[PDB]
Design a protein around this ligand. Structure first.
Ligand SMILES: Nc1nc(=O)n([C@H]2CS[C@@H](COP(=O)(O)OP(=O)(O)OP(=O)(O)O)O2)cc1F
Ligand SMILES: [Mg+2]
Lengths: 399, 553
DNA sequence: GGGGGGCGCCCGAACAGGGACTGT
DNA sequence: GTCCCTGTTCGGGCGCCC
């Protein structure tokens, strides 16, 4: 017997167009779907069902296994609606994909129509083939909820026996944290997997996640341009740290001078720059995580495989500010790096606050949509929007 | 006959009801066209006589077909369409001959009276009431799908897909391009065995009530299909006849751009920038527009292009997909996709202007993006690129654009005009270049403004402006400093606005003023553009703020 | 002459969202 | 707050197909 589920009041189902898929991805999707159809998990539907949700497929890691992924973001936003603080403090955390579990539960009949999706054909040889879910679909926020009761019964034994192991669930995902040596840990996880095989993304280390402080140049000679760049950067930071002062440094820029004129630092300005250096290394004050608000993630391309990001719910109230380094090579692919960055950040967010951020991506909309699923490896998908970042803010966070 | 396929359940939008609309009057020729059709359909159970228990009605008409010998019964269901539920359309695109692979044997079949072979939901039939005017007039309803109803295409396309599924699973290696009721059927059998599989498909369709008249059963090349002629090793588009007026309205312009667009899929070098500019502002279709000298000339070039003979080839998957792009000027690009040189699969153009201000490297990146997505639709994979841009050019652009940008695997092609960056901001301030502090102020009420600079060598200039804006004066000031500066100049601005535009290295703009600025940036040897926070007492931003502020703010 | 769905192309009308501005 | 500027979406023409 199914749990009755309804959309948020005054909200209709998703009507998102399927995007074009590669031949590889389509062959995989058709293979997976005909099998799911054999098992009753999905049913063919017609076009009288007005709803649609995009679908694609990822080939995880090195394998020859595709995993179907349904972009359920729209539906999740329209479905009716504590977190382990210790999970971020374990030396190892593994991420298990417990998606298959959901297929064991039937899905409320009157909700099924909202889980419609369509498989495209190469060169439009045929009209799209539409399907519908009969079990709990992976990717849906309703799935982990409804399966919660049953999920607790599964782990309960394993938890009792391993009270120093923290097990956390988010959507299709199981986070398992330990302070075990990396050997007993992997043996523990394989234990827990044996424990799950019975009842029908590695490896994280939240203990070495890094905060990226704002920092000020160090120099022997300062030019007018240097000081100007400094004063503007401190002006901005003083919105994040009210303690920042600019008066003495700005005094040196009195008059109207050549950008490359060297300007000797007075004693005052010398000190007020030292103070500022320390005011920058403090907790930002009055930053309370509010679960009822979305996490905003903001990313800047710093170049040379360097990407910076900040997570806040309100401007200048950063919950975390971080960096993401990558290969300074020839075969650099910005879009790939950027989607690896959003995945790292989403991951940190799930692990820290149990929530997904909304991303402000420093990429063209069209560029992003053309390529991001070639590099995706997560079972979830964060919200995002696109933004031509002021090249000013790029300079503020640089290292 | 009528398919024993199950109906698709439809319904009106909530709280709504069927159409009540007077039959408007018809030609005699059309009334007899209709009557002949309706007496036949009625005989076949495809329509039913109704009585006064049916309040509804919706006007019917007819048009000659491409056969010019047969009529097509149509129904202006625009009102019922409004009150009918939404469908999800299953037709995701248009198949393209360039995506076909060489097949040993080919057949093309058209289903006869397609829609009228598919049952309509019983519960819904009453809203399809119409009336043939004529002896008095007769009132019918539809038992099958009607032409002019918005649910009919998707329901047909979905039904056709159910019907072919079993034949497809049984015959995985017969390829069947299914567009409406049109079937391209290809195989690698000898023509003997092929013809036998065709018969099995035809029987299969006939068991589900879909006939395939020998009249529309093409057995020999060249096949007519989707607007093409498919020869065994090459394909062609059926002749494109351009209009030839001497006056041109918005409507026959729109008509000419369209035929040109259509043409560009296999005719290289088609251009329509100058022609589509005409369409700007113009309030109605009937409105006449005079061909600009440039549009005039463009239309000529296209006309010469269309005169040549051309063709495409089919896809060989054991080989690579290559896309070659060519710069065409005006934000216009052309591409040819191929596998073996000088044998195009297809061609295309890209001209979309997006952005107030842009440059050629951006536009090239948009072209690559569109082409990639189109290759994925047609061939299901990305092509390898040949682009007229040096690896060093792209590299520079990429390591200095603050955005993530990327092009798939490509290789450079010396065929001009090469794409380039037309100037480059310095990353460090310039020694021995004069320093300009620029600024602008505008009064929001009077719309009066001042723009101006102050330099470290003691020069100052203020220009007064009318009917202007803050952003505009900030841009005016930068322009002014470019005008009165040497080949090398340092400019300090407090405008994020202005800094964001120039820093992205535009070479084209909608803006007259930005274009003038760009002209200057190209003439310079070195420019370095720095930013400072406004109204923070930072000289000599301070100095120039006082100048342009006076009498404005 | 009057209808439908698909994709394409162009355009301009609504919006959304962020920066700059006012102030006896 | 307001005004300016830019970007998105979406609806409306035309092209092509059935
Ligand atoms: N202009 C059209 N409007 C349509 O709704 N259609 C639809 C309704 S009939 C279907 C198939 O087109 P077609 O020309 O084969 O019409 P059929 O009813 O199958 O006529 P034939 O017996 O094949 O001559 O597509 C076609 C058009 F050309
Ligand atoms: Mg037909």
């Amino acid at each position: 017997e199914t749990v009755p589920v309804k959309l948020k009041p005054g909200m209709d189902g998703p009507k998102v167009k399927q995007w074009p898929l590669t031949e590889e991805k389509i062959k995989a999707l058709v293979e997976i779907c005909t099998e799911m159809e054999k098992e009753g998990k999905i049913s063919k539907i017609g076009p009288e069902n007005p709803y649609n949700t995009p679908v694609f497929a990822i080939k995880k890691k090195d394998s020859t296994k595709w995993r179907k992924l349904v972009d359920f973001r729209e539906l999740n936003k329209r479905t009716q609606d504590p977190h382990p603080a210790g999970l971020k403090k374990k030396k190892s955390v593994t991420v298990l994909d417990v998606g298959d579990a959901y297929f064991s539960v039937p899905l409320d009949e009157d909700f099924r129509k909202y889980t419609a999706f369509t498989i495209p054909s190469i060169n439009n040889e045929t009209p799209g083939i539409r399907y519908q879910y009969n079990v709990l679909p992976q990717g849906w926020k309703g799935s982990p909820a409804i399966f919660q009761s049953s999920m607790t019964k599964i782990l309960e034994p394993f938890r009792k026996q391993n009270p120093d192991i923290v097990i956390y669930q988010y959507m299709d995902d199981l986070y398992v944290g330990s302070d075990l040596e990396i050997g007993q840990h992997r043996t523990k996880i394989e234990e827990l997997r044996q424990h799950l095989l019975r009842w029908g993304g590695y490896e994280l280390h939240p203990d070495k996640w890094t905060v990226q402080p704002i920092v000020l140049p160090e120099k022997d000679s300062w030019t007018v341009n240097d000081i100007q760049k400094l004063v503007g950067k401190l002006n901005w930071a003083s919105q994040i740290y009210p303690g920042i002062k600019v008066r003495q440094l700005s005094k040196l820029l009195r008059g109207t001078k050549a950008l490359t004129e060297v300007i000797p630092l007075t004693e005052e300005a010398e000190l007020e720059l030292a103070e500022n250096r320390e005011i920058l290394k403090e907790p930002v004050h009055g930053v309370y995580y509010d679960p009822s608000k979305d996490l905003i993630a903001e990313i800047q391309k710093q170049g040379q495989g360097q990407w910076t990001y900040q997570i806040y719910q309100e401007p200048f109230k950063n919950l975390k500010t971080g960096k993401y380094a990558r290969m300074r090579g020839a075969h650099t692919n910005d879009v790939k790096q950027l989607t690896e960055a959003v995945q790292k950040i989403t991951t940190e967010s799930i692990v820290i606050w149990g929530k997904t951020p909304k991303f402000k991506l420093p990429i063209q909309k069209e560029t992003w949509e053309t390529w991001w699923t070639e590099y995706w490896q997560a079972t979830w998908i964060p919200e995002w929007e696109f933004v031509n970042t002021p090249p000013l803010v790029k300079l503020w966070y640089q290292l | 006959p009528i398919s024993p396929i199950e109906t698709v359940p439809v319904k009106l939008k909530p709280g709504m009801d069927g159409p009540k609309v007077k039959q408007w009057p018809l030609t005699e020729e059309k009334i007899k066209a209709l009557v002949e059709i309706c007496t036949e359909m009625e005989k076949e159970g495809k329509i039913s006589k109704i009585g006064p228990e049916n309040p509804y009605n919706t006007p019917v008409f007819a048009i000659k077909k491409k056969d010019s010998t047969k009529w097509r019964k149509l129904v202006d269901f625009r009102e019922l369409n409004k009150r009918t539920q939404d469908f999800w359309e299953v037709q995701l695109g248009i198949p393209h001959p360039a995506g076909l692979k060489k097949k040993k044997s080919v057949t093309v079949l058209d289903v006869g009276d397609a829609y009228f072979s598919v049952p309509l939901d019983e519960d819904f039939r009453k809203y399809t009431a119409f009336t043939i005017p004529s002896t008095p007039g007769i009132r019918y309803q539809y038992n099958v799908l009607p032409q002019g109803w918005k649910g009919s295409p998707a329901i047909f396309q979905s039904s056709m897909t159910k019907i072919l599924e079993p034949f497809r699973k049984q015959n995985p290696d017969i390829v069947i391009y299914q567009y409406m009721d049109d079937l391209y059927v290809g195989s690698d059998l000898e023509i003997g065995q092929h013809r036998t599989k065709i018969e099995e498909l035809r029987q299969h369709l006939l068991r589900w009530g879909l006939t395939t008249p020998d009249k529309k059963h093409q057995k020999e090349p060249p096949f007519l299909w989707m607007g093409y002629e498919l020869h065994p090793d090459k394909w062609t588009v059926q002749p494109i006849v351009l209009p030839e007026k001497d006056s041109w309205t918005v409507n026959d312009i729109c008509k000419l751009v369209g035929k040109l667009n259509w043409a560009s899929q296999i005719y290289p070098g088609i251009k329509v920038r100058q022609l589509s500019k005409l369409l700007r502002g113009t309030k109605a279709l009937t409105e006449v527009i005079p061909l600009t000298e440039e549009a005039e000339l463009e239309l000529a070039e296209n006309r010469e292009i269309l005169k040549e003979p051309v063709h495409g080839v089919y896809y060989d998957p054991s080989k690579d997909l290559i896309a070659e792009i060519q710069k065409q000027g005006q934000g216009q690009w052309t591409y040819q996709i191929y596998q073996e040189p000088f044998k195009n699969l297809k061609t295309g153009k890209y001209a979309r202007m997006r952005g107030a201000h842009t440059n050629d490297v951006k536009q090239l990146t948009e072209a690559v993006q569109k082409i990639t997505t189109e290759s994925i639709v047609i061939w299901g994979k990305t092509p390898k690129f040949k682009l007229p841009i040096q690896k060093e050019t792209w590299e520079t652009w990429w390591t200095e654009y603050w955005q993530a940008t990327w092009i798939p695997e490509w290789e450079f092609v010396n065929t001009p005009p090469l794409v380039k960056l037309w100037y480059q901001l310095e990353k460090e301030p310039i020694v021995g270049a004069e320093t300009f502090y620029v600024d602008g102020a505008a009064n929001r009420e009077t719309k009066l403004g001042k723009a101006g600079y102050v330099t470290n060598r003691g020069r100052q200039k203020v220009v007064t402006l009318t009917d202007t804006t803050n952003q505009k004066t900030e841009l005016q000031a930068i322009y002014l400093a470019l005008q009165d500066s040497g080949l090398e100049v340092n400019i300090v601005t407090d405008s994020q606005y202005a800094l964001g535009i120039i820093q992205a290295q535009p070479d084209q703009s909608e803006s007259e003023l930005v274009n003038q600025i760009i002209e200057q940036l190209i003439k310079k040897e070195k420019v370095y553009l720095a930013w400072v926070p406004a109204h923070k007492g930072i000289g000599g931003n301070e100095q120039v703020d006082k100048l342009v502020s006076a009498g404005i703010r």
